[PDB]
């Protein structure tokens, strides 16, 4: 699709699409950039993540609206339309997972890139789990857990406890535990331990890094306040 466009042009257009709030375009541009086969820089990884987060975020919000209407009703139209949105959402998740598997993760050697992509893998399996029903749900849940766990193991070995990627991974894994895995106690323990270990490391940071880390720490605290 994007095979005729220069990598640098795809990246430039992804940034313009973000400014224009054209997130479907942004995701297509970044998919094209990934398919050029080169590794992604830190900024380019962020563009890929922002693009697909916005696309799947719109789909998840629509699926929740339709699922709530469908549950209140219980013609075929509400179910049929919820199913259509769900299939589209699953297709976006499968596209992202496919990019990670071909071949972003296998080429990611540095902790910052590998943790970033594995967190993404856990997130997109988590979005699949939100709409899955039955034993399909079990294997999807295990795939999310496995990706998050590998990312956690790397992050604890290779990054300081204030690193924003490490903090966001722990935040999202804690949400996985609470909302997906029916493990609220594990969610609370992870959020508390992550927060406390980051607090103890803030003294090492510059003013700008302090702002980055404390922003995410506040998200951990917000969840803990809602969960306790």
């Amino acid at each position: 699709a994007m095979g005729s466009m220069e990598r640098a042009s795809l990246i430039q257009k992804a940034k313009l699409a973000e400014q224009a709030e054209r997130y479907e375009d942004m995701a297509a541009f970044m998919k094209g950039a990934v398919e050029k086969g080169e590794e992604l820089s830190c900024e380019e990884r962020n563009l890929l993540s922002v693009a697909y987060k916005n696309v799947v975020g719109g789909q998840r919000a629509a699926w929740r609206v339709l699922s709530s209407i469908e549950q209140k009703s219980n013609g075929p139209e509400v179910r049929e339309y919820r199913e259509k949105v769900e299939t589209e959402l699953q297709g976006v998740c499968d596209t992202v997972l496919g990019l990670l598997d071909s071949h972003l993760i296998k080429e990611a050697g540095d902790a910052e890139s590998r943790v970033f992509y594995l967190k993404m893998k856990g997130d997109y399996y988590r979005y699949l789990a939100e709409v899955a029903t039955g034993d399909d749900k079990k294997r999807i849940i295990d795939s999310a857990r496995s990706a998050y766990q590998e990312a956690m193991d790397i992050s604890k070995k290779e990054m300081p406890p204030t690193n924003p990627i490490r903090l966001g991974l722990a935040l999202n894994f804690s949400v996985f535990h609470y909302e997906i895995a029916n493990s609220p106690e594990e969610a609370i323990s992870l959020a508390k331990t992550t927060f406390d270990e980051a607090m103890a490391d803030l003294h090492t940071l510059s003013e700008d890094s302090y702002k980055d880390s404390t922003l995410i720490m506040q998200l951990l605290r917000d969840n803990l306040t809602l969960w306790t």
Binding site: E18, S49, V50, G57, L171, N172, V175, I216, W227
Partner: peptide, 9 residues
Amino acid sequence: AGSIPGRRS
């Protein structure tokens, strides 16, 4: 609750 919002770069 809330995951990383992650929609702005």
